[PDB]
Amino acid sequence: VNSFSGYLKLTDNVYIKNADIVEEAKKVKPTVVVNAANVYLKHGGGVAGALNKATNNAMQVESDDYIATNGPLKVGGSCVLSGHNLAKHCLHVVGPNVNKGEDIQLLKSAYENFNQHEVLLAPLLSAGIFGADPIHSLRVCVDTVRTNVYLAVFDKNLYDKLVSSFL
Ligand SMILES: C[C@H]1C[C@@H](C(=O)O)N1C(=O)c1cc(O)nc2ccc(F)cc12
């Protein structure tokens, strides 16, 4: 038993809700919140900008130190950093950005990072400003993640489309 509420169950291990991941994180304090990161951990907009804003820019300060030490992430890769006031940990995961021409097949590699964590609150990778089809992203999530994932979908119209079209 865990503290996530109001989720619709899609499969044995994947759950989905219409929610703001920031507010969802603020209430649940999950062990892991997933950020929709880029390779530079520049959290300017989308999910990353909202998560970072909710940390009063502490996420960005920590991220800049990480990059100065380690260099950029790989597309499809991830790193674990602090969850600040939102979660114990933040798993920064880089899905391919279609608006940068990155290969969509890397989306499966991106979701594989979730399997290193027993339970996660997450957005749909490569959705939103990353330009992928959220329905495809949901399919890859279901077919790749084996750990327990709670997906927060900000837009109510998209949420309804994702549920109604789910196979
Ligand atoms: C994860 C992808 C799918 C879509 C969604 O969750 O609905 N995403 C967003 O990043 C997003 C979109 C949108 O229209 N408003 C948003 C408002 C706040 C926020 F933090 C994210 C969004």
UniProtKB/Swiss-Prot annotation:
Q: Which part of the chain is the Macro domain?
A: 1-167
Top-level taxon of origin: Viruses
Q: How is its activity regulated?
A: Inhibited in vitro by GRL-0617.
Reaction it catalyzes:
Thiol-dependent hydrolysis of ester, thioester, amide, peptide and isopeptide bonds formed by the C-terminal Gly of ubiquitin (a 76-residue protein attached to proteins as an intracellular targeting signal)
Q: Where in the cell?
A: Host endoplasmic reticulum membrane
Its record classes its membrane topology as: Multi-pass membrane protein
Q: What does this protein do?
A: Responsible for the cleavages located at the N-terminus of the replicase polyprotein. Participates together with nsp4 in the assembly of virally-induced cytoplasmic double-membrane vesicles necessary for viral replication. Antagonizes innate immune induction of type I interferon by blocking the phosphorylation, dimerization and subsequent nuclear translocation of host IRF3. Also prevents host NF-kappa-B signaling. In addition, PL-PRO possesses a deubiquitinating/deISGylating activity and processes both 'Lys-48'- and 'Lys-63'-linked polyubiquitin chains from cellular substrates.
Assembly: May form homohexamers. Interacts with N protein.
Protein name per UniProt = Papain-like protease nsp3
Organism of origin is: Severe acute respiratory syndrome coronavirus 2
Organism lineage reads as: Viruses, Riboviria, Orthornavirae, Pisuviricota, Pisoniviricetes
